Amino acid sequence: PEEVLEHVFSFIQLDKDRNSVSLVCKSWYEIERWCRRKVFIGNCYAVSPATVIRRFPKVRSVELKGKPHFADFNLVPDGWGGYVYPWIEAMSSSYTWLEEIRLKRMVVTDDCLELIAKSFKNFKVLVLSSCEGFSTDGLAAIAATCRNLKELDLRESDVDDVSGHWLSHFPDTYTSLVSLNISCLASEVSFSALERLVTRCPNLKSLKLNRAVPLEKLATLLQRAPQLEELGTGGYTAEVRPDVYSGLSVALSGCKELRCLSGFWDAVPAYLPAVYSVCSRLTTLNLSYATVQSYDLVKLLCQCPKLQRLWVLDYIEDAGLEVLASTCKDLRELRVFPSEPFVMEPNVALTEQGLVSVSMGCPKLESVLYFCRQMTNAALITIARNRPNMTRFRLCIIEPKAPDYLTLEPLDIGFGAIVEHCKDLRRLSLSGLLTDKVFEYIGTYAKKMEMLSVAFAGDSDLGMHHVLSGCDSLRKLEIRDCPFGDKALLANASKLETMRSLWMSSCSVSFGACKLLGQKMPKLNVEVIDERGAPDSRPESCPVERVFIYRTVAGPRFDMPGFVWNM
């Protein structure tokens, strides 16, 4: 009975649950749209501003993702798309009460930022995860205008460096900042502006600095920010001096609420110890940019018993992870990045025994990203054996098509065990020497798997076909340099419709099959992204460079650059 329904509905905040209510009857469809607070739009071309604005009119929070994931590997050329302007314009006049905009991998310009700033009075949360196309003039515009701002989170964005002067446009009456993340900025912000800023903002819980803030100034900021829950240091290097060390040590330990640490660029082993007051209550540690050798890392990790997330270079090494394994019983997620990929010549001693160790040791480990240079099915089988609760596993063997190094064999059984034994594996990245067999594996067992990424693997379309055929939960599949082509793709065209997207580049998908697929399937945009010009000026049997395929309810897009073609 309406009022009551409104209120019951407010308790439901899950997109899948929201959707689910909207389909019970016309009447629930109706109440529900009207009191929908946020929309998640994982593919910005899947639907149109106007469609969204007109269904869900009282929206306070919008999330948009642009380019697909393989943009992070440089495999989507510029101009491709991602433009958010149309969204701001549309929402600008329609969404007065709009508070948050989280964009991922979109093009965002100074003009957008301006328009956000101008149209949105209650505007509180701007996250720009991996965006590009604005400069600090844009951020100035936000600083100056958004009286109520709470988050300015620029994680990974590519900014134009005009000047670190944008930050000082926050007016002296501004206090409401909760989270500031400027790690991608190279522009040196004004230290006094910042410091003054940190001080009048009593609710600021997350501060992530850029490299330009030097170690020596860290302590000062922290004295102003004693209630911080997350800190990302700036530069973490300096002349060794016990004044400096000590000022650090105290300020750091006056932050009793600190749980996450990152930053550490150029970090000096002499100054990490400063951070040991925090270590014992720390849940997230991100040591990705520290090039500190293993023992140092070990000394830091020994005293991190409550640690849930660790990202670290492979400098940690096997011994490293052996420690981690006895030390952090609560560890949920581990990411080991490479320190030196473009050498095939082991500069660290990080092997598979590392991950193997962690997997007996951490009852709760369930997300992995691991870069090593060698692997075996026995490792993988053991890992799968040990970690049935695993839910994301991304292995990345550096030298491609590398076989198991003891038996010289494919890694198919290795990975088979992962997918067999890890019934909630919701995500997966593969590497090493792999035959169509792994795919039969994936297809038979990976039933909950949502996301698969594959490179230099498989034998024939039969690989891709097992995957489109068996993987019931698939949402995103992305393939590069495999011998998958037309057969697999057309035998399974209707699957594409149950999936947010598929991406294939440097594969064997002919221009011919692209056209056919377009025709069979009006409602997919089947996009050829190719850089040698008109496709119809090559024999239709010729492989396209890249094709990107996604369902949409909006038909072909209006912003294709010159090297993109909708079939």
């Binding site: 209120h7 649950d17 009857c25």
Partner: protein, 76 residues
């Protein structure tokens, strides 16, 4: 005790269905019941729900499908 600015069947109202908590204006209890009802739903299909109430569908597949498409393709 005294609350519903609707003020200002007896059932458990005093020893503290929604209808009408609602009523009579007992803010807090509305929240007590509405949150637990909401649970009745979290993680249930649209059929599963309309079963466990007494809303019979009035969606003719034309529309029932077109919504499910928008929902999934664009909002999930």
């Amino acid at each position: 005790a005294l609350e519903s600015q609707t003020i200002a069947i007896l059932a458990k109202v005093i020893e503290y269905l929604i209808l009408a908590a609602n009523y009579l204006n007992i803010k807090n209890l509305l929240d007590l019941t509405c949150q637990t009802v909401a649970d009745m739903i979290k993680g249930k299909t649209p059929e599963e729900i309309r079963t466990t109430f007494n809303i019979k569908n009035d969606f003719t597949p034309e529309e029932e499908e077109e919504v499910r498409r928008e929902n999934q393709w664009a909002f999930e």
